[PDB]
């Protein structure tokens, strides 16, 4: 009962561009009483060199059913990266002082993506 995440991936191979559309989440679990329902998504390429491997959506306010409707683009993604790397997608709530609480995540091996073929996802978040 952590919550369900919706997203779409496309690897525009010829332009070395992996386009990650973070669509929405539904039923994000209420947690820290002192925290806020200010959800946002973080992307990580694993293994990665930190900083540059990370992308982040807009933070919404007062919602457990956020609609981000946003495409995060990893430019300079190669066949070697698609072979090696895993896309970790993590949902978190931003708190009163710009810190956060981790709600849940999902992971997808980029080997399974096919060049120029959009894959849509509707998954439930998990904790590892």
> Which residues carry a binding-site annotation for Ca(2+)?
31-32, 38, 93-95, 101
Q: Which of 121, 5, 20 is nearest to 66 (CA)?
A: 5
Q: How many CA atoms lie within 13 A of 84 on its CB side?
A: 9
The DSSP secondary structure of 98-126, one letter per residue, reads S-EEEEEEEEEEGGG--TT--EEEEEE-B
Per the annotation, binding residues are 31-32, 38, 93-95, 101
Structure tokens at 97: 């002082």
Pairing relationship of beta strands 54-56 and 39-46 according to DSSP bridges = antiparallel
């Amino acid at each position: 009962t952590l919550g369900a995440l919706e997203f779409s991936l496309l690897y525009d191979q010829d332009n070395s561009n992996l386009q990650c559309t973070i669509i929405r989440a539904k039923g994000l679990k209420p947690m820290d009483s002192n925290g806020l329902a200010d959800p946002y998504v973080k992307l990580h390429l694993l293994p990665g060199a930190s900083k540059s491997n990370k992308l982040r959506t807009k933070t919404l306010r007062n919602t457990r059913n956020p609609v981000w409707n946003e495409t995060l683009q990893y430019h300079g993604i190669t066949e070697e990266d698609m072979q090696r790397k895993t896309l970790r997608i993590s949902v978190c709530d931003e708190d009163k002082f710009g810190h956060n609480e981790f709600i849940g995540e999902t992971r997808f091996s980029l080997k399974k993506l096919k060049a120029n073929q959009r894959k849509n996802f509707n998954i439930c978040l998990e904790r590892v």
